[PDB]
Amino acid sequence: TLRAAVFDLDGVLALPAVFGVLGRTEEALALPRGLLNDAFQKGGPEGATTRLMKGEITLSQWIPLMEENCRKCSETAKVCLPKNFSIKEIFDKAISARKINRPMLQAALMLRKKGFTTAILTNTWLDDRAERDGLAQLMCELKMHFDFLIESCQVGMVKPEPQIYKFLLDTLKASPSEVVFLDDIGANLKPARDLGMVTILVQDTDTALKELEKVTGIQLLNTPAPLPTSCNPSDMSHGYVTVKPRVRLHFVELGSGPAVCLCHGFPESWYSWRYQIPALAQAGYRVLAMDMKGYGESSAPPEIEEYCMEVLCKEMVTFLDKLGLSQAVFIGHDWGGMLVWYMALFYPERVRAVASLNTPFIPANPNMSPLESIKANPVFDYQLYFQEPGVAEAELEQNLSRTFKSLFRASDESVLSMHKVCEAGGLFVNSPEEPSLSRMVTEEEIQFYVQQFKKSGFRGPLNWYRNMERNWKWACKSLGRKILIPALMVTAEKDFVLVPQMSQHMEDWIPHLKRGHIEDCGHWTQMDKPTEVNQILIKWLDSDAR
Amino acid sequence: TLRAAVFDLDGVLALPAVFGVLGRTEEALALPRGLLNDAFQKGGPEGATTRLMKGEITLSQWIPLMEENCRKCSETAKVCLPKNFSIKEIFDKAISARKINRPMLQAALMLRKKGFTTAILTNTWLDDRAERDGLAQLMCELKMHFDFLIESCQVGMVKPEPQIYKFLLDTLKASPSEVVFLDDIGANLKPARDLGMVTILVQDTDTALKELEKVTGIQLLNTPAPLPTSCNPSDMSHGYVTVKPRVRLHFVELGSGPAVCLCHGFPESWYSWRYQIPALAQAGYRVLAMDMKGYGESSAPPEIEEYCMEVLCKEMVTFLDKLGLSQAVFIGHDWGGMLVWYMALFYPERVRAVASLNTPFIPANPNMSPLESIKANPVFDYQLYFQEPGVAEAELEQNLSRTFKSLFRASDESVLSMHKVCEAGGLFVNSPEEPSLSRMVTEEEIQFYVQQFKKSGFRGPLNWYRNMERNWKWACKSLGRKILIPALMVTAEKDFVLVPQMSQHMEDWIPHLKRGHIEDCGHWTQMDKPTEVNQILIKWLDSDAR
């Protein structure tokens, strides 16, 4: 029974193989066949390329030794190299062309999910070229998906020396017959096969995956597309900023580039952005995913007026000041979406761009109190239930597992009647005590929210709903303004509270507004349709925010 | 007795005044005198500019109303505006030209140091132009130096309405005769003077500062240049990353832009970079100042081999992986400087650029154990004293205040004989029990280090010295490599341990090395000559790392 799978980087996990670019260079420049491959291997174990792969010299030190090898090879072949011949140019473009072989990476991820330990065993070099960041970026995306990354230049050994295969087995803690080894170079499979390992010679990807399916007994080809990479809380960088005495904000941070601030809704967490955080960082952004005030590890003062929009927005500005950020892109969902529109309206100089998921921008009506507008629409009756301090807290904190299992559901799995909540005497009065698990979340994901709400409870989060009059008075000061910075509104077809039709007149206030729309998507947008959300945000960020 | 000073932004803290650029535009375009100033003030309290300053409309909404005002003014003056006339272009360049009036800012900082509460009271607008980041950046540098920032567009009031002066006094908690008010516009001083405040009309900076000196009785003009801005620990964003089980690294983070990682020496803290962190962030860098392993809030395992260079460097790579950083500029001092040279040698793809303060790169000698090389030089005798576990710990932890007061001294204030430390039986055997305070540090700064070392003690920090053989064996693997990425070596004239002469052959290994040299500077480079360090690092970062 196989339990480990080892992959080579060049020619297996990343295509095209740098070695294959030497063949293409020979044809393009009309050089004798194999000339560049002979210069590359010149000297064997005592040669310059072996010294490079063992980490004795760097790539920049090797480049002139390879040029010397090219001339000595062309001298015996009785040929002349062109005047513009450059090993640096050839290798720079070969490394640049190399991209992740997505089907191979997906097969490795599927095997890891099914219990396999996975590793990359590669012959590679210490890259000190001015363009080395491109390679560093490639290695970073790859290494996060594998249990082990063994590089020849770090261990002083190279394939096909039998010592590196022994080192591999010691690292994996497995016997040879428990390992599948994939490589595009035949000479590299020979020692693995002598040990008794299963070997797959990789010529084309599809045939290699067909062989891999047959030995593992696991379907890898023709399977559904997987969900985006989700992040593990214990692997994140956690940040804490004190914005004022007794008010500290917690956030998770990933990536480099323009700052993007993610603002969750009710009753959520920074964890509600788990599928967006790796995708946005990989697209070239520095992601800051907040625990909003009243939630998780951020401070939760009991006073109602600590959660009015004017105070929340001032603290978010202080948060940027203390981090040394002149601007950030603000992306919000639900209550966070409301906050991001007010950030654009009152502090436009600090907001690079603004996006809201589900929450529309609706201007304040100076002739009508918001408490009267809410009574007219029966779907917002639960907001009246949330007004009296202590009432909704007691119900929502009684059983945390029940609370999160009943709320976090897809649109076709609804278990909560959101009508006559006040008359019924509660949110969960005609609801099951043990609801089934939604297809959207796992038990482990529910337990993360349960643990976060054991710390401060629902008082802080519910206080966001208890400043209707204060928010309305403050918003009335902005009625003469327009939002003229880059903006995105994303509607969710099946959000039965924040309906797409509530956003129809936004163009009157944000004349250059961009739109996104997600079909078959309910209220919990980020975890309901993560791939669709990622694609919409990344496209908009790349065109209007960078 | 005065106890508060209020400054205007435009024409006082930032020059040239945006209002004065209208006068220059009229002369350049040969328009009638005062034409642009009349259009700007057109309508008075009911006018477009008053609505802008009150926050009713944004700058982009105001621009076409000002253009309309310009045409109506030119119609009554019987003149024609040129075809290329643009209010946007005029205002864009006026805002761009405005820079901090350094002598005025220095006078405000001196008053704040002497006990005064300081504030900015300004007539300003909500800037939503595509170029608004330049203004946001200006406001961020300024606001950190003042107790209060009162902006007209945020409070709905404008100078010279008497309501804003009443609001100012309520905010300051002071009576009118305790306030000095500086403004370049005469009409704005009138209400402050009616209340009984001291007013200074600002035409030229030097005369305004002479008047300010006379009323406060404090010297502001002709004083020595102040030290760089230092940061307050409670105002920083603190980050925590788990690099492996039981090993968590703490860092402080400030700024946006290319990542710069600061690595302290022994026995120090992230706090040793207090004068560099605000300067590097202001220059356009995202600064990450570490608590190295064994120190402050980072994990401190007791095992010696947890502090060998191979393990420390691997953890720093994992730190970049978990933060989502493909590369960082590495800047080290003392033991941190040694680590940064090994990062460049073993992980060049992750290092954008490398700088060391005091610590030279000295290649390993494969023919001689490092323990024998140390015995030949009598100045490194204290490193032999540090070898036996428990001995130096007991002496250094006995009195923490004495330990840091004896070490952190300028070169002319030395109280420690670094010769025959082993024979003497200790580092502080012929040293005072209560040493005087060095001119380099304050009692408050010493107490920060005292508190940090009360948590884990000296075991972790001293373990960095107890892996000589392990480090030497690992370094021998790099003897065939050269450092070919951008590099800076900064020598300190009066470091009597890490002497400038120890770095003389570095060019053999780092052929493109850049150099810096600080005269009259001892071992504690960052806090001994902070302005000189800042200037050298910023110039190098701007040319070779960005």
Swiss-Prot record, chains A, B:
Protein's name in the database: Bifunctional epoxide hydrolase 2
Gene coding for it = EPHX2
Q: How is it modified after translation?
A: The N-terminus is blocked. The covalent modification of cysteine by 15-deoxy-Delta12,14-prostaglandin-J2 is autocatalytic and reversible. It may occur as an alternative to other cysteine modifications, such as S-nitrosylation and S-palmitoylation.
Recount the UniProt induction comment for this entry. Answer: By compounds that cause peroxisome proliferation such as clofibrate, tiadenol and fenofibrate.
The record lists the effect of C153Y as: Decreased phosphatase activity; no effect on epoxyde hydrolase activity
Where are the N6-succinyllysine modifications?
K54, K420, K454
Q: Source species, please? A: Homo sapiens (Human)
Q: What does this protein do?
A: Bifunctional enzyme. The C-terminal domain has epoxide hydrolase activity and acts on epoxides (alkene oxides, oxiranes) and arene oxides. Plays a role in xenobiotic metabolism by degrading potentially toxic epoxides. Also determines steady-state levels of physiological mediators. Bifunctional enzyme. The N-terminal domain has lipid phosphatase activity, with the highest activity towards threo-9,10-phosphonooxy-hydroxy-octadecanoic acid, followed by erythro-9,10-phosphonooxy-hydroxy-octadecanoic acid, 12-phosphonooxy-octadec-9Z-enoic acid and 12-phosphonooxy-octadec-9E-enoic acid. Has phosphatase activity toward lyso-glycerophospholipids with also some lower activity toward lysolipids of sphingolipid and isoprenoid phosphates.
PTM-bearing positions, type N6-acetyllysine: K42, K190, K214
According to UniProt, the reaction catalysed is: an epoxide + H2O = an ethanediol; (9S,10S)-10-hydroxy-9-(phosphooxy)octadecanoate + H2O = (9S,10S)-9,10-dihydroxyoctadecanoate + phosphate; 12-phosphooxy-(9Z)-octadecenoate + H2O = 12-hydroxy-(9Z)-octadecenoate + phosphate; 12-phosphooxy-(9E)-octadecenoate + H2O = 12-hydroxy-(9E)-octadecenoate + phosphate
The similarity comment for this entry is: Belongs to the AB hydrolase superfamily. Epoxide hydrolase family.
Residues that coordinate or bind substrate: Y382
Which residues constitute the catalytic centre?
Answer: D334, Y465, H523
Q: What is its EC number?
A: 3.3.2.10, 3.1.3.76
